Amino acid sequence: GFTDYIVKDIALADFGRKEISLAETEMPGLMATREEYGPKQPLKGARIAGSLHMTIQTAVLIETLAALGADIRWVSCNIYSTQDHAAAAIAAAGIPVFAVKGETLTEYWDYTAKLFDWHGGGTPNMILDDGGDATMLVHAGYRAEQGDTAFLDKPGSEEEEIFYALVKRLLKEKPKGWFAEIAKNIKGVSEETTTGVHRLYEMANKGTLLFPAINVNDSVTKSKFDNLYGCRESLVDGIRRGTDVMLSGKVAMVAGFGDVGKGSAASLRQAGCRVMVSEVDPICALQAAMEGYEVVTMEDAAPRADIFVTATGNKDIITIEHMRAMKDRAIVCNIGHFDNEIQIASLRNLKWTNIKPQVDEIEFPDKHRIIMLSEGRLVNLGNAMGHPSFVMSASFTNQTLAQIELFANYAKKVYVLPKTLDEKVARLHLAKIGVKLTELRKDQADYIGVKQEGPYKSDHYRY
Amino acid sequence: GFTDYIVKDIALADFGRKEISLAETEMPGLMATREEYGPKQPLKGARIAGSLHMTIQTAVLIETLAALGADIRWVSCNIYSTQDHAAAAIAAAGIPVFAVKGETLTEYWDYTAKLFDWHGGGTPNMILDDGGDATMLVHAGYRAEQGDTAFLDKPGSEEEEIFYALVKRLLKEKPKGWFAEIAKNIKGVSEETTTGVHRLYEMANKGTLLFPAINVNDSVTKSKFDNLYGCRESLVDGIRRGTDVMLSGKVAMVAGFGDVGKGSAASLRQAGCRVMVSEVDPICALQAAMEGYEVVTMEDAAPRADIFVTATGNKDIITIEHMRAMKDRAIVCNIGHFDNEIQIASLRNLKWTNIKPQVDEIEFPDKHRIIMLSEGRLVNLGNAMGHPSFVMSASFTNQTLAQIELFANNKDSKYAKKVYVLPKTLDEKVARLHLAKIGVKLTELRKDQADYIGVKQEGPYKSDHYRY
Amino acid sequence: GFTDYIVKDIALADFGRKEISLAETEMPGLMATREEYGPKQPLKGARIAGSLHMTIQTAVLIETLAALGADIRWVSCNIYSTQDHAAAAIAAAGIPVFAVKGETLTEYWDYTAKLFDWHGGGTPNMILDDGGDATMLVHAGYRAEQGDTAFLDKPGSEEEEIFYALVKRLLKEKPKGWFAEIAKNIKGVSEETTTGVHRLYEMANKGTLLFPAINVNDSVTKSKFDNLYGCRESLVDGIRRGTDVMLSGKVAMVAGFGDVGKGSAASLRQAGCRVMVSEVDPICALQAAMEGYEVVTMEDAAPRADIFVTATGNKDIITIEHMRAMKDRAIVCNIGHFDNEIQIASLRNLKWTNIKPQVDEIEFPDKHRIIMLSEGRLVNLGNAMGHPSFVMSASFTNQTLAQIELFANKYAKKVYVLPKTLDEKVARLHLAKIGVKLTELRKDQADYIGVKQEGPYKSDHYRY
Amino acid sequence: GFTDYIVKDIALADFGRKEISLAETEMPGLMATREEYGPKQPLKGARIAGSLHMTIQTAVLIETLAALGADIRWVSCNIYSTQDHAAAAIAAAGIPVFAVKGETLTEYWDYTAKLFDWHGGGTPNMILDDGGDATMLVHAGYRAEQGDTAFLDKPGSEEEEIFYALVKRLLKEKPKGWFAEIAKNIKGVSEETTTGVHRLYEMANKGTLLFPAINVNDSVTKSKFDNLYGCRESLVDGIRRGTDVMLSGKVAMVAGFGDVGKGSAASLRQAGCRVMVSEVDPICALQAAMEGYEVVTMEDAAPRADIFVTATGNKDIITIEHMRAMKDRAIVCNIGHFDNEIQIASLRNLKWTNIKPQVDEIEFPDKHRIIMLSEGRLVNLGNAMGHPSFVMSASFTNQTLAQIELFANNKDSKYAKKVYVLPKTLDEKVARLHLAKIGVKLTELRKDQADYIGVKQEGPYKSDHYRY
Ligand SMILES: NC(=O)c1ccc[n+]([C@@H]2O[C@H](COP(=O)([O-])OP(=O)(O)OC[C@H]3O[C@@H](n4cnc5c(N)ncnc54)[C@H](O)[C@@H]3O)[C@@H](O)[C@H]2O)c1
Ligand SMILES: NC(=O)c1ccc[n+]([C@@H]2O[C@H](COP(=O)([O-])OP(=O)(O)OC[C@H]3O[C@@H](n4cnc5c(N)ncnc54)[C@H](O)[C@@H]3O)[C@@H](O)[C@H]2O)c1
Ligand SMILES: NC(=O)c1ccc[n+]([C@@H]2O[C@H](COP(=O)([O-])OP(=O)(O)OC[C@H]3O[C@@H](n4cnc5c(N)ncnc54)[C@H](O)[C@@H]3O)[C@@H](O)[C@H]2O)c1
Ligand SMILES: NC(=O)c1ccc[n+]([C@@H]2O[C@H](COP(=O)([O-])OP(=O)(O)OC[C@H]3O[C@@H](n4cnc5c(N)ncnc54)[C@H](O)[C@@H]3O)[C@@H](O)[C@H]2O)c1
Ligand code: NA
Ligand code: NA
Ligand code: NA
Ligand code: NA
DSSP: OOOOOEESOGGGHHHHHHHHHHHHHHOHHHHHHHHHHGGGOTTTTOEEEEESOOSHHHHHHHHHHHHTTOEEEEEOSSTTTOOHHHHHHHHHTTOOEEEOTTOOHHHHHHHHHHTTSOTTSSOOSEEEESSSHHHHHHHHHHHHHHTOOGGGGSOOOHHHHHHHHHHHHHHHHSOTTHHHHHHHHOOOEEEOSHHHHHHHHHHHHTTOOOSOEEEOTTSHHHHTTIIIIIHHHHHHHHHHHHHOOOOTTOEEEEEOOSHHHHHHHHHHHHTTOEEEEEOSOHHHHHHHHHTTOEEOOHHHHTTTOSEEEEOSSOSOSBOHHHHHHSOTTEEEEESSSTTTTBTGGGGTTSEEEEEETTEEEEEOTTSOEEEEEGGGSBHHHHTSOOSOHHHHHHHHHHHHHHHHHHHTOOOSSEEOOOHHHHHHHHHHHHGGGTOOOOOOOHHHHHHHTOOTTSOOSOTTOOO | OOOOOBOSOGGGHHHHHHHHHHHHHTOHHHHHHHHHHGGGOTTTTOEEEEESOOOHHHHHHHHHHHHTTOEEEEEOSSTTOOOHHHHHHHHHTTOOEEOOTTOOHHHHHHHHHHTTSOTTSSOOSEEEESSSHHHHHHHHHHHHHTTOOGGGGSOSSHHHHHHHHHHHHHHHHSOTTHHHHHHHHOOOEEEOSHHHHHHHHHHHHTTOOOSOEEEOTTSHHHIIIIIIIIHHHHHHHHHHHHHOOOOTTOEEEEEOOSHHHHHHHHHHHHHTOEEEEEOSSHHHHHHHHHTTOEEOOHHHHTTTOSEEEEOSSOSOSBOHHHHHHSOTTEEEEEOSSTTTTBTGGGGTTSEEEEEETTEEEEEOTTSOEEEEEGGGSOHHHHHSOOSOHHHHHHHHHHHHHHHHHHHHSOTTOOSOSSEEOOOHHHHHHHHHHHHGGGTOOOOOOOHHHHHHHTOOTTSOOSOTTOOO | OOOOOEESOGGGHHHHHHHHHHHHHHOHHHHHHHHHHGGGOTTTTOEEEEESOOSHHHHHHHHHHHHTTOEEEEEOSSSSOOOHHHHHHHHHTTOOEEEOTTOOHHHHHHHHHHTTSOTTSSOOSEEEESSSHHHHHHHHHHHHHHTOOGGGGOOSSHHHHHHHHHHHHHHHHSOTTHHHHHHHHOOOEEEOSHHHHHHHHHHHHTTOOOSOEEEOTTSHHHHTTIIIIIHHHHHHHHHHHHHOOOOTTOEEEEEOOSHHHHHHHHHHHHHTOEEEEEOSOHHHHHHHHHTTOEEOOHHHHTTTOSEEEEOSSOSOSBOHHHHHHSOTTEEEEESSSTTTTBTGGGGTTSEEEEEETTEEEEEOTTSOEEEEEGGGSBHHHHHSOOSOHHHHHHHHHHHHHHHHHHHTOOOOSSEEOOOHHHHHHHHHHTTGGGTOOOOOOOHHHHHHHTOOTTSOOSOTTOOO | OOOOOBOSOGGGHHHHHHHHHHHHHTOHHHHHHHHHHTTTOTTTTOEEEEESOOOHHHHHHHHHHHHTTOEEEEEOSSTTOOOHHHHHHHHHTTOOEEOOTTOOHHHHHHHHHHTSSOTTSSOOSEEEESSSHHHHHHHHHHHHHTSOOTTTTOOOSHHHHHHHHHHHHHHHHSOTTHHHHHHHHOOEEEEOSHHHHHHHHHHHHHTOOOSOEEEOTTSHHHIIIIIIIIHHHHHHHHHHHHHOOOOTTOEEEEEOOSHHHHHHHHHHHHHTOEEEEEOSSHHHHHHHHHTTOEEOOHHHHTTTOSEEEEOSSOSOSBOHHHHHHSOTTEEEEEOSSTTTTBTGGGGTTSEEEEEETTEEEEEOTTSOEEEEEGGGSBHHHHHSOOSOHHHHHHHHHHHHHHHHHHHHSOTTOOOOSSEEOOOHHHHHHHHHHTTTTTTOOOOOOOHHHHHHHTOOTTSOOSOTTOOO
C-alpha cells in the first residue's frame, strides 16, 4: 500500500491515464526526449521537488523526468489549476503528489512544505518551479534561520500571513538548520514563468539567490509559444467554460501587451471580440496599435468593456473604482499572476454569490454585478484546462533540458539555455505538425554567415 | 406534488436557475418580448409542445412563452444536448420536461410521445420543433391511423425501428383516432432548423402537411446569425472540451459550406487551424475558395487532416473507407444532423474505448485509432454547451413571434397548410431588439434619403429577395 | 481605316493588348463562355450599346461579346474609371469606343449619345449598362419626345443640367421619333449594379420601362463576389495609390454594410485599420456588430476617423458639417455611387489643391484640410484599377449570359434575374483555375437532400 | 544656378513638395525631432553622405538632417527605388542628390562615388547607409590602398566587376591614399537594414571595421515595425500595382519567416491568399506553423503557388529549376535584398517581354511563362512606393538619433570601431513620439507598481534581452 500522496480521488486515475496517453501523442518534444535520454539516465540520482500546475501535461513531464532517472515529489503551484485525474494518475504511479483542484491557501502551503521531506529521508536536490513558490519557501526559511525573523510578523494579505505562519511552523518543527540543509543540497532550480523568473533575477541582483537558476521562461521556444499561443488558445477556453457568453459583438479589455497580453488579445479578437489594450511600455503599446487594437487606460475601458483580462504580471491593474464603473455583469478575470492583478481583497465585503466552481457573481451596493472567474487567479488553468498539450511539450522539453543542465552539465546566477538547445526544442515539434524544414546549402549558409546546423540567429535576435 | 417530469437530478435546479438568470441578461430579444407581450398574454390558452435541445437558452425561451400565457410540455431534440441543470430548473418551475443528457434512443422517442399526453388530459394545440421529430411523430401516426401502415413494418435504421415501434405502441395504447385528434388540435408548428424545415416543404409540396408551419430557420436573424455565428463560437468550444487539443498547427476538414459549414470553418480557422472544405454546390465552393479555404474532396483530406467536421445535412459524408485512411488519433465530429453524416453504424465491430462522456477512442484492425465526439451527434451541444445565449436570443425571439403568429394571428386563415416565414418587418424587429445590448447605434434615414432609395424610414429596408 | 472612336492615347494599344492577354488567363469564365457560345454565335445580329467602365476587364467582355457575333459600340459609365490602355486596345481592334480617363461630364454625356448613332446607320438593339445611364437617356428622350418636355427645364444638379441639355440637343438635331425608334429597336437591357437595378425596378413598377431587363447585379455570383470580394481587394488599392498612407493604426469609417460596405469594411480591416460602420438597416447593423465592427453614426465618426468611405448608394452621407468636424488631412472617398454620397458640391468654394490626378486637398477657412479621392466618385476605379480580373470574370460571364438570354433566348417589360442553374454554371466555370475540386453527390445523397445531382443545389430563396 | 544634382526631372519638384508636406503629417517622429533639435543644431559641421532609397520618406529625413545642421549629399541605394518627384524636390531644395528610378548599375556606383567628393572639396564625416554600399566602397578602397588588391581582379556578379572597376577608378583618379583620408574623417556610420548590419558585424568581428557604427536595424522600433509592418503594408501594394491580380483564391509562397517574411506572409494572407512559407530556422518554422502557414520546401511550392516572394536575405532561393517547374504566368518577386534571391541571371537568354516599367513576362523554351517584378529587385520599392511614411518615421527617427550619437555624443569616444545599438530609453522614445498621432493613450506606472516589476517609472521597461 502507498500512503504518501494527497489527491481528490484516486479512482480518477484510469481517466487520467487515458488523457495522458492522448497527450503523449500531442507532446513529441517530451517523447523524443524520453527516447534520447531514457537510455542515458542523466537524472539518475535527481530528487526533483516540483511545484507546477498538476495538469495532464505536467503528468507527461513528470513521467519524462522519471524516465530519465529522476526521483520525484510534486505539488501544484496554484490552488485551482490541478486536474484531479492527472493528479490521481500520478499518485497511482507511485510518485508522491499533493495536489487538489480547489485547495485552501493553508493546504496549498502545507503541501509545498511536504515537497522537502523526501521519502526515505533527506531533502530534494533539484527544484522545478513555476511562479517560484517552492524556491521562495526555501529562501524565506533560510533567511529566518540565519536569524532575521522580524519580517515574518510583517502584516500582509491572507496568503502572505499563511506563508509567514508556515515558515514559523517549519522552524518550530524541523531540526535546527533544516533550511540551510535544503539550500545546500539544491543543485539548481529551473523556473517556468515570467513572474518567478523576475523574482530570481532580483535575488541574484541582491546576492541573495541560494543556488543557480535556469530561466526556462525566456527560451524562445517557451516565451514566444507558450506565453503567446498557449494563451491565445486557453484564455477564451477559460472564459467560455466559465460563462458560456457570446464573444462576437462584445468589447474586451486586455491589460498588458507582453507575450501573454499579445496572446490574450489575440484569443479574444479571434473569438470575435473587439479588443482594447492598456500598456505602460510605449513600444508594446505601439505594437498593439499597429495590430489594430485601440490602446486605452483602464479608466477609459472600465465603463465600456464587456470582458476584462489582466495580463501584466503587475499588481493593482483592475481596482475597486474600475469595477464600480463597469457595466452590470461585466466579466473580469486574470491570466497573469497570483490574485493581485485584480483588487480581489477589496471585494471581500460585497455579496459574492457562487455560480459554480471558479465562477462568482459579486454584487455592488448599487445592485450592479460583475462576474469574477477563478476568484482572480489564472483563468485558463482555473476555469478550463490550461494550455493544450502540444505547446506545453515545447515548454516542458525546455524544462527537462534545464534540469539535465543543472543536475549534470553553472554559478549562482540566472541562465538561459543555449540557442542550439532552443532550436532543438523547435526541431522536435516540426514533424508532428507537418512542417518540412529547408536546409541551407553550404554556400547559402556562408552567405549569411551561419553554420548549416545552426544556431541561425545571434543571441540578440528577437524573432 | 408535481411529478410530471423526467430529468437527471432535480437538485441541479438552483445551479440551473443561476445560469438562467445570467442568460436573461444575454437575451434582450426574449426579455423585451416578455415586456411587450406579457401584458397582452397573446399565448393564453396555448398548449405548446416543444422538442428542442433542453439548454439554458431554451429555458429562457420556455419561460418567455409562459410569461406570454402558454401552457408548456418539453423534451430535448437530441439524446446528448440536454443541459441537466436547465432541465432541473424548468421542472422545478412546475413545467413538465422529459430531458436527460445521455438518454437512450428508446427513452428519447418515448419522451417525445409524452409531449402529446397533456397534463390534465387532451393534446397540445401548438408544436415548437427543432429538426421535426415531434412533427414527424404526429404525421407518421396519422398516416398509419388512416390505414396506410405498410411503412412501419420494416424500417431502415435502428432509430427508424425504435421510432416505428413507438408508433405501433401508440396505436395500441392511445385511443382510436388519437393522431387525428392531435392533428386537429394543432393550430401550427414553428420549425427551428434547416433539416426540419426541408421536411416541412416536402410535406407541403406533397400535400401531406397537416397544419400551418412557420419556417423560423430562414428568418434572416436566425439562419445568418445562429447557423453562422453560433457555429463559429460553439464548434471549437465542443472540440476543445472533448479533446483539449492544440488547434494552431492543425489541419481541419469541414464538409459543407452552407451557413453551418461557413460558421464551422471560421470557428476552426479563427482558432488557428489551416482549414479545408468540401462542397457539392459550385457557388458555395467558390465562396469557400474566395475566403482562402482549400476546397478538396473527403478522399483527398482523409489521410491528411487532424480534425474532421461534417456540416452538410446529408448522409454518408465520412465513410468507413475515409476513417480507415485517417492518421492515428484524428478527431472526427458532426455539427449538422442526426448521426449519419458519419457512418457511425459501420464502426460498431471495432473496439470502442470510452474516454469520458461523449468522447470515445475507436481502434481499427491496423492499430490506427480515431477520436469520435458525441458518437457522431451534434458536437457543439453534445461536447460543450451549444450556441451561446445572445445569438439564441435572436433564434428564439423568432420562435416566439412565430408561435404568436400561428396561435393568435390566424383568425382569417392567413396561414394555410403551407410553410411560411415571418414578414421582413418582424425579422428587422428581431435585429433591433439586440442592438442596444451590444452598443450598436443605428442611423435613422432622413426623410429625403428614405425617399431616395425607395423605403420608409421605419423599414423594411430591403426587398424580400435580398440575401444579406 | 477607323476613326469612329475617341480615346486618350491610341499609342497605348500595344500595352493594353498585353494586359488584356494577361487578364484573359485570369478570366476563365469569360474565356469558357467565348469557347462554348462562340461557335453558336448567339449574338449574331446583335448591336450592343455598352455603357460600362472601360477597364482591361471590360475589354475582355467586349471581345467576348464580339466573339459571340455582336456588333458593338461602347462608352465608360464613369468619368474617372477608364483605363486608357484598355480603351486604346479596343479602338485599335476596330470597335467604336468613346472613353477617356478624366473626361468631363459634358463629354461623358456626348459620348453616351454616340452609342445610339450606329455605324452604318440605325440604332442599337441591345443595351449592356452599368448604373443605368444609357437606359436613362433612351427613357428621358422618349418621354420628352412624345410630349412631356417640362421636366427637362428642371434640373436638380449640374450633371442633370448637362444631361437635360443633351436630351434637348438630340431632340432638335435627330430625326423626329428618333427615341421612339431606338426604344422599339432595343430588345433588352442587362444591368450591372445595385443602383442601376434600383432604377429599372422603379420604372417597371411604374410601367415606364420601355423594354425587358435582366438584373445582373443580383446573380449570386455577382453580388456576393464582385460587390463583396471585389471591393475587399480594390478599395484599399485605391486608397493606397492615392495617398500611400499607412493603414495599420488608423481608424476608418465605412457607411453602409450591404455587400459593398461589407467588402469595403473587410478591405480596410484586412489592411490593418480599426473599422467602424454605419447602417440604417438593423439586420445589416447586427451583422456588422457580429463581425466585430463598432457600429456608430457618421456624427460619432466625423471627429474620430482617419479614413471615411461611403458605400451606401444613398445621398448626403458625408455632409459639409461632417467634413468641418474631421481631423486635419482625413481621407474621404466614395465606393458607392455617383458623387452625391459625399456633399462634393458644397466644397466647390473651398481652396482645392490638386496633388495628382484624382487626389485633391481641400482647405477649410479654419485651415483644416481633407484629402478627397477622385472628386468623390468610385475610388477603386478612380484611384486604382477597379476590381481585379478574376472576380470580374464572374460578373461579366453573367453579363454575357444575360445578353444571350435577352437577345437569343417570355421576357416581359419586367426585371428578371438569371435562373439558378446559370448562376451555378458561372461559379463552376471559375473553380478549376483556382484549384477547387467539387464533390459530386451520389444519387443516394442527391435524393436525400432533395436535389438533382447536377443542380441546382439550393432553393431560389437561398441567401448563401 | 546651383548645378550639382542628377535627377530624372527637376520639373517634378512641386509634386514632390506636395507629397512631402502630406508625409510630414504622417511622420510625427521626424517632425518632433526637428522641433526639439532644430534649436540645438546638434549636427552643424556634420557632412553626411546618405545612400538610401530616394523616396518621399527619405526626403523628410533629409530635410530633418538639414534642419539639425547637416551638410548633405545623397544617393539611392537601389536602381529602381527612387521616387523621381521626391528627388526633384530635394534637388530644388539645393541638396546634392544623384538618384533616378531606373538608373544603370554603372551610374548607380558612380553616383555612390559622387558621395565622397564633398562640395568645396574634402570628404564627408558621417555615412548614413542602407545596405552598406557606401560603407563597403570606403572599406574596399581602403584595403586596396595599403596593400591588398588581389580581390579587385576577382569578380562575382555583374554588379561586382562594376564595383571593382569603380574602386579601380578612384585609386587611379584620387590622390594616393584618399580611401584612408575618408575612413579617417568618418566619425561614424548608421546602417538601416539587416543585410547591411550583418556585414558591419562580420567586419567589426574581423577587426577591419574602420569607424564606429550604430546598428539602426535593431532598434525595436525599426526591425519590429519597419521590417514587419512595413512589408505587411507594401508587399501586396507592389504586387497589385505590378499585376492587378486577384489575390483571394490564390496560393502564395514566401521564402523566409524572419521579420520581413512574417510581414510578407501577413501581407498576402490578409489580402486573401493561402500562404505557404519556407524556412531553415526551426524556431521561425515553428512560428509560421503556429500562425497557420503551411511550411514546405521551395521544391514543393514551385508547381503549386500562383505567387512567389523571396524574403530571406540569402541567395539562390528561387533557381532555374524552380521557375521551370512553376505554373504558367506565376508571379515571382523579391523583397529581401539585391537581386540574387531569384536566379535572374539564369533567365538572361530567354524571351523577356516588357509589360510596363518593372513588370516583365519571361518565356521559357517550353512556352510557359512567368511574370517577374522589378527584375528581381525589391518589389515594394520597385513596383510601388516602398513602406508608408508613418512606419519610415520610426526608422528615420532612429536614423536621426543615431546620426546625433556618432557625430555629437562621441567626445569621450564611447563608440569604438564596433557595432552598437541605441539605448532602450531612446528606442522607447521613438515609440512615444508616434503614439499621439495614432491616438494611443499610454498608462503610467505608479511607483509601487514600477518597483513590483523592477523598473523605473520613466523606463526602460524591459531588460536589454527582451524580445517583444
Ligand atoms: N496563465 C498562463 O498560463 C501564463 C502563461 C505565461 C506567462 N504567464 C504570466 O503572465 C504574466 C505576464 O507574462 P509576460 O510573459 O506577458 O510578461 P511580459 O513582461 O512579456 O509582459 C508584461 C507586460 O505588462 C506590461 N505592464 C506592466 N504593468 C502594466 C500596467 N500597469 N498596465 C498595462 N500594462 C502593464 C508590461 O509593459 C509588459 O509589457 C506573468 O505573471 C507571467 O508569469 C501566465
Ligand atoms: N449544430 C448546430 O447548432 C446547428 C445550427 C444550425 C443548423 N444546424 C444543422 O446543420 C445542417 C446544415 O445546415 P445549413 O443551415 O448549413 O444548411 P445549408 O443548406 O445552408 O448547407 C448545407 C451545405 O452542405 C452542402 N452539401 C450537401 N451535401 C454535401 C456533400 N455530400 N459534401 C459536401 N457538401 C455537401 C450543400 O451544398 C450545402 O451548401 C443541417 O442539418 C442543420 O439542421 C446545426
Ligand atoms: N465601386 C464598385 O466597384 C461597386 C461594386 C458593386 C456595387 N457598387 C455600388 O455600391 C452601392 C451599394 O451597393 P450594395 O450592393 O452594397 O447595395 P446594398 O443594398 O447591398 O447596400 C447598401 C446599404 O447601405 C445602407 N444604407 C442606406 N442609407 C444609409 C445611410 N444613410 N447610412 C448608412 N447606411 C445606409 C443600406 O441599409 C444598405 O444595407 C451601389 O451604388 C452600387 O451600385 C459599387
Ligand atoms: N524591402 C524592404 O522594405 C525591407 C525592409 C527590411 C528589411 N529588408 C531586407 O529583407 C531581408 C530579410 O530581412 P530580415 O529582417 O527578415 O532578416 P531576418 O534575419 O529577421 O530573417 C531572414 C530569414 O530568412 C531565413 N532564411 C535564410 N535563408 C533561407 C532559405 N534558403 N530558405 C528559407 N529561409 C531562409 C532565415 O532563417 C531568417 O529567419 C534583408 O535582406 C533585409 O535587408 C527589406
Ligand atoms: Na490542457
Ligand atoms: Na450555451
Ligand atoms: Na483591374
Ligand atoms: Na511610401
